Symmetry: C2
């Protein structure tokens, strides 16, 4: 949870939405196609005209000691290539990549990716599941894309939180706040539906779903004792 | 909830995963690039060499009276074009499409799409949200992509179900089955986090998340009285 700069390698629709979500932070977009420059600037970010597979260009984009580097190239091959180059410059910087083919997630990880996201798998699955209803899709589309009614959130548990050492069962988060708790994160591991007898700890990241008002309630509920 | 055939227009990673999910049903894949033929056949589906923007080719793919038609072309423009052609052949057939740009979802709908999925928005968002943790991503990736531990499911409420006319609160589904109920679907509408005082009805589709064993428990719990 730092506040350095972010580097985005490659341009695509993903990168565009992603850049929107970062509207209000210093971002550097490294890309070959010069056309894109306009769009990147007209969005607050800094454009760095270059090649993400070229280590010298990655350097010019300030990949070293960056808060995180996001990669989404025109090819899983190029993404793997870019990543390799990144690790050469900084072997600790957090790397998030987009995989187009499922079979490449592993290789992407082996290259140095800290988090891999596979949109087509997600898409193809939602589609095959919408041949009769659209409920699952509607849900995903509403919470993960248009973030309409609800939204998915990560809420860190401060040191001295009111839920410090409180079991899931006793916290009664959903009924008190309206937020559906879907998981707890500790040491970059994730317990999907944590057991009622699970106690919280400072540092833990509660993963829930809820409307902005319910998320705000949860945040007050998580607060540290005054 | 019928059992006719499915038509997939266009080829891509989405289409490939989607075709996997339909492994065990009669599917027709309409595509221009002949290379793909091998992959489609080596997956149980029928390949139809043609152009999805051409109404005569859509016909050869049995788009008429199909259970559902899934569209994912090399362009939102082409997807809109394909859809228009589809409505010309059958104005009632369920259409599921993939939008690459957010601004096209509406136009895609106006063209005739019954359900639109936007993978890049979903992707770009997950990425911008993973610059420090990967919990949200891990969750999505695990339940929506690799469907590892948990999986998302739609469970229809049979006529005469044991939960017929039972309020959410009284059903106590999560504690009894272990499945996290995230929403109810009725008349192609979706109530994300239905209120405790909401009663179920036959026809309703419960949308939850759970492990295969928990989903099976829920299915027994939903059953109609003998």
């Amino acid at each position: 949870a730092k506040s350095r700069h972010v580097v985005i390698c490659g341009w695509s629709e993903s990168t565009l939405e992603c850049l929107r979500e970062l509207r209000g932070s210093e971002v550097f977009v490294l890309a070959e196609d010069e056309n894109v420059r306009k769009k990147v600037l007209r969005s607050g970010a800094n454009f760095v005209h270059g090649d993400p597979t070229r280590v010298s260009d990655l350097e010019k984009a300030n990949v070293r000691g960056a808060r995180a580097v996001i990669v989404d190239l025109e090819s899983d091959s190029e993404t793997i290539h870019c990543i390799l180059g990144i690790r050469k410059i900084d072997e600790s910087v957090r790397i998030i990549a987009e995989a187009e083919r499922y079979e490449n997630i592993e290789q992407l990880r082996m290259a140095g990716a800290d988090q891999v996201i596979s949109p087509f798998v997600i898409s193809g699955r939602l589609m095959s599941r919408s041949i009769d209803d659209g409920y699952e899709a509607m849900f995903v589309q509403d919470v993960l894309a248009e973030e309409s009614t609800r939204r998915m959130v990560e809420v860190p548990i401060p040191e001295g939180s009111k839920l410090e050492g409180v079991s899931v069962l006793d916290a009664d988060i959903h009924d008190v706040t309206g937020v559906i708790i879907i998981g707890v994160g500790r040491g970059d591991e994730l317990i999907i539906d944590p057991p009622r007898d699970y106690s919280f700890r400072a540092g833990d990241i509660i993963l829930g779903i809820g409307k902005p008002e319910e998320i705000e309630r949860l945040k007050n509920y998580i607060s540290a004792l005054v």
